[model samples]
Every structure is written in C-alpha cells, then in structure tokens.
Target: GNPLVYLDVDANGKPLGRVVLELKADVVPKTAENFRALCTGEKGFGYKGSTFHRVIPSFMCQAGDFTNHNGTGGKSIYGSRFPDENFTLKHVGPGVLSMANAGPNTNGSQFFICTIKTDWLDGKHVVFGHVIEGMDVVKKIESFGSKSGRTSKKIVITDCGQLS
Candidate 1:
C-alpha cells in the first residue's frame, strides 16, 4: 500500500523543500488513511497551510493543526478524533511518523516526524507512516526548533497533497 504524500515546507516564508511520506497502510490501515486524506484535503480543510507548531531537535517535528496552527487544534477525517490503530510500527529510528493525542485512543489530525529515535513514545503513538524522502528537508526544519518545542522561525507546510 503505497499511500504516498508530499509536503512543501518553508522556513520564515522561504522554500525549504519537499518531504515525502509513505503511509504504512498495510500495517496501520485506518491510521494511514486518515493521514492520506488529510494531505489530499478530502476533508473541508487539511494540512495545506499549517505550521509545524512544535518541533524539538533530536526529537520530532509536530504539526497538522490546520484549524488553529497550534498544538491545541486538529480534527481527524473521521470526526473530531478516532481510535488508535495497531502500533505494529515502532519508533526505532528517525523519520518515523506518528500520531499525537491528549490521551489514549484520541488520535486527531496532529502528527509528527522524528529527527531521532524516541523509544519512549513506542506503543503510545500510532506509527502510521514515515518520511521516505526529504529527510534532509526535515533536518532543515529542525534547525528552526528549540528545546521548548517551539519554532524559532515559521516552519510551515506551504503545500501538501497525495502523491499516488
């Protein structure tokens, strides 16, 4: 299941490059589909102009709150939230994509891409996909991040869409 997608990122309104992610639809079937449709804008609104509201270097870059552009907002394609799919995928390496939630079984449109292995998040966050291309671009975005999980610059997803 090559549910591929791409995000065109910008730093302080300058082009950074593209980050392509391949969703593990075969593993986290429902979780993967949520992300795929979010990218495609199948919902009325999606990740098109959202900023990476939280980014911790050596950790992960978090965003997808298109509604508020902050960590507090985001609704899943299914509704406000959805149940967690299997965590068959692990956070064993960087570039991993996982869901962000307030607590158990509260998956929304919020997601993150890792810059380093975060073993602590295993089994808690749904590993729906990973960055298959533009890891460098992700690292570039990481440069704007701080330890406080805030961005020094406006690292935004200028555009996003399903690839195939």
Candidate 2:
C-alpha cells in the first residue's frame, strides 16, 4: 500500500534488529518520497549513519538529523526544508511516523516515531509513515530516552534503505 523502508538500529555498539516503516505514499506522496529519498540517501543526505538524537518515553523517538546529527539540523531532499504536505493522517497509536518541524512549513529531515498515541502532536506535525514491524527495536531505542534525549549511549541508524 506504500513504500516500506527499514532502519537497522544499534545501541552503544550492539545490533538491535530492524525497524520497518511504511511511509504512507498512497496518502502523502511528497512527504513519503522525502523520507524514502533520505532512506536511500541517493541524494547524499541520508539517515544511514545518523543518530536518533532525541527520544522520549510514551511520546516519540526523534531522528533524521544526518547533517548535524543533533536536534538542530536535517535537510529534505528538496533542500534545507520544505512545506508540510498535509495532516490527513493522525497519531492514532504508537509506531506512528510523523515529521518534526520548527514551525509552520519548516519541515526538514527530522522526524519522530511515536511510542504512544500522541494526540497532542496531531495537526501540528505531518504524519507521514508507520512502523510496520520491529516495535521491539523501537522500544529498545526508546529505552535510551530516559537517561537523556541525546543519550550517553547513542542509538543510531546503522543503515537504512527502501524495501519496496
């Protein structure tokens, strides 16, 4: 139904398995393609070696700052940032993939994976995808959130790419 991508996650230095994401391309093509492009990193700015950077329990685990590798930076394939496609999707439950932005129309490469149903984030962020598989891996990453947003033990995307 959509572009299914994957993230091979690692913590500190150990493998945590894969997190599969179904970017709802059927709905938000632009946003989905943006993520897909970054996933492949065919454009060069990708999440291959990027860190999750920020994570919060029961909220979401944020990532995609391949450039700065921190919360401050990330760029869309379209360039630095792009406008929000739409808010047709909702954060109905955990595993919801949504774009993280500075403000209106300031969407960059940064995004977050929901750990719970985050209704508060609805209408503010563009919900682009869902974690179709490997919630355990996400939870593993989320476990790193409490100690710090940018934790001492980095939760990184060791590698990532499109599955279909």
Candidate 3:
C-alpha cells in the first residue's frame, strides 16, 4: 500500500469527526491489499452513505459495508471471504479497529472499533488498525438506539486519503 491514511465519518450531520488508521502493511499484507484497493478511489470501499448500524455499548462499534450501509445485503469487494489475518495486537482499550466476521475464515469488509479493552477477543478477530483521534465521536455513535432488534446508528465517509 501507499502512505498511511486517515478517514472520517460525517454521521447524521454531526461535527466533522475523524479516525486515523495506522496501517500495518508488514503484518497484514492481504488486509492491506483489500484496504488499499478501497483507498485507490476506484469506488472500492468508499461507497455512498455506508455506515455502521450496529453498536454494543462499550464493547465495540462497526462500519464499512458498501453494498448496504445498514449492515445487511453487502459483500466483500474481494468477491469471496479471506482467511483471518489474525495478529497479536491486544485489544487494550478503546479505538481498537479490527475486522468482523461470522467465523474463522469468513471475514469480509465489516469491521469494529472497541471502546474498551476486550482481552477475550485476542487470537480470533483481526486487529488491523486503531483510531488515532475522534474516539468520542464513536462513543456518541454507540449511544444511539433502534426501534426493533435492529440498530439504527449511521455514519458517512465523507472523504478518505493519506494525511496531508
């Protein structure tokens, strides 16, 4: 991949919040491949109005599903799932970004940012990045509620690129 980049979500017209991804190209070649493909500006991951509709208190908050911003009816741009790029990075606290999946090798585009250290998550999910700033914005996002069993939290990736 190219230089590391920063991404911000303009959610619900709130303040222009930001989240910096500390890309680990050395540790996660495949994950970086997919992530860089999205950053190439070829309409890979920055799809219109994509957001994380699921939030679970201090556990974690998720986003990134271009096909459907609501967390359903979406597919990984990789066409199929990839093996877990599991790393030894400990989920030591908030702002820990990692890939979300249904099983060991079923990871796609969906990801989560934890608001607290989840030591139990180690050796399972792939911890690819961390939020360098604007974690308060993520906390606010996790505070929202939904009508039914489904969540309604939302966010928008206004613009994402290397930090100038």
Candidate 4:
C-alpha cells in the first residue's frame, strides 16, 4: 500500500479540519509521484500554505497553487507540466483526488478533490488519489462557497506529509 498524505487546512484563520488521501502509486505512478513529492517537499516544492483557490459544493475543491496562492500559478516537482497519466481510475463517486490542468498533458501541482460524484470528469483529469478521512472537513469548506463557489475565506494547506 502507498503512504497516506495528510492535509491540514484552515479557513478564515480558523481550523477547518484535515483530509487524508491515499496515493494511487500503483495506478498512476507518475501522477502519484508528482503529488507525493509536492506534499513531502521532496523536490523543494510542497503544498504547505497553498490556498484552495476554487471550490464548488456540488463538484470539488481545488488547491495546490503554492506559487501564487491564486489559481493562476503552480508547477510540478519537475518544474514543468507533465503528460497525463490517464488511467482506469474513474471519478464515479466523491472523495476522488485528481489533477487540475489547462489542457491535455498539462498536469502540474494543482489538484481537486471531488466532494460529490463527478462522472463528467472521467478521462479529462488524472485520478491519482482519493480521500480516506475527514470528508466532513471538506464539506465544511464547501459550505463557505460564494456565488461561483469561490471562497473569500482562505482554505490553507497548513501542513502536508506522507504517513506510511
């Protein structure tokens, strides 16, 4: 089994909760390695202090833009976009963790955790992990959604690490 990546977040300077995701190392090796390296600061990059720039209650929560804290900036541990590790993993249910990209083969550090079934995302994004704990915390953050579901509150990834 691959190690679990723990995400501790805060919203509006208050504790939001934590999310534990199991990296799909066997399924999406490259994507998983990219995510793992980012989380552990293995390549001088990590998700610590990044904001969940986008959030959609009925859809998913996006984050991992450690560079700008906004949605416009992010990069993989390799310092560039990587090809999609599109695999058999399906986004048929909630808690799916997938890569966020501008187009095909542009997978970087940004990713989204599906809060609800999002079958429409199948084959469009690389599914590399899934939430294993603290989904209620994810829902709590989702509740803070605004018009487009973008939160004025900062959902910060205070800490992230791999637990074997």
Could you say which candidate leads in TM-score? 1
lDDT per model, in order? 0.90, 0.90, 0.68, 0.86
**For model 1, how does the per-residue alpha-carbon lDDT over 1-164 read when each residue is reduced to its tens digit?**
56999999999899999999999988888898888888888867899988999999989899998888888899988899999888788998999999999989999999999999988998899988888899999999989999999889998889999889
Cα RMSD for predicted model 3: 2.9
Q: Write the per-residue lDDT of candidate 2 for residues 1-164, one digit (tens) a residue.
A: 68999999999879999999999888999999999999998986789988989988767899988878878888889988898898999999999999999889999899999999999888899998898899999998888886457565788899999999
Q: What is the TM-score ranking, best to worst?
A: 1, 2, 4, 3
* Candidate 1 ranges with C-alpha deviation above 4 Å: none
Q: TM-score, each model?
A: 0.97, 0.96, 0.81, 0.95
Better of 2 and 4 by TM-score: 2
lDDT string for model 3 (1-164, tens) is 43366666765767457666666666777776566556445554453356666777767876667666666645555766788875667777888878877878877777788888987888888887677677777776767634331455345666666662
Of candidates 3 and 2, the better by lDDT: 2
Lowest lDDT 10-residue stretch of candidate 1: 36-45
Collision pairs in model 1: none
TM-score, candidate 2, is 0.96
Deviating ranges (above 4 Å) for candidate 3: 1-3, 43-48, 145-153
RMSD of 4: 1.1
Better of 1 and 3 by lDDT: 1
In terms of lDDT, which candidate is strongest? Answer: 1
Q: Write the per-residue lDDT of candidate 4 for residues 1-164, one digit (tens) a residue.
A: 78688999998789988899999998888889888888888787789878898898788888888888777889987767889877589997889999998989998899998888888888888888899999999898787776585787778888888887
Pick by lDDT: 2 or 4, better one: 2
Q: What lDDT, from 0 to 1, does candidate 4 have? A: 0.86
